Ligand binder design. Sequence first.
Ligand SMILES: [Cl-]
Ligand SMILES: [Cl-]
Ligand SMILES: [Cl-]
Ligand code: NA
Ligand SMILES: [Pt+2]
Length: 129
Amino acid sequence: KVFGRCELAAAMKRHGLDNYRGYSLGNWVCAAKFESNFNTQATNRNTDGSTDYGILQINSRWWCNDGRTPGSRNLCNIPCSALLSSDITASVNCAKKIVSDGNGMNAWVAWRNRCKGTDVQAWIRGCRL
Ligand SMILES: [Cl-]
Ligand SMILES: [Cl-]
Ligand SMILES: [Cl-]
Ligand code: NA
Ligand SMILES: [Pt+2]
């Protein structure tokens, strides 16, 4: 599914991301924009052979199992394919674990380079939330 911007904001809010670990909703929307262009089916292979999955590009190195990332962990205890569903529940639950883990949203490289310090509120402007 390709979410609309306000559509995604609403789903994220409903699933308790808004201000989770102090990150406002626009942070999460902005991260999703630049990670996946709001596409739940997005996949990208990393140089190390790990793969990033879903709306938030959660990496199989640590967070989900894909059967093909040697040495990796599955700290969200999910198949990586669950991160590609039209329903964002598994993605959000796993994101919550990731952002709690010490580096906050810096774990998302596109967040750090494209969202951090910017006017992230723009991402939820005009949404009925
Ligand atoms: Cl915001
Ligand atoms: Cl694996
Ligand atoms: Cl933080
Ligand atoms: Na893994
Ligand atoms: Pt939820």
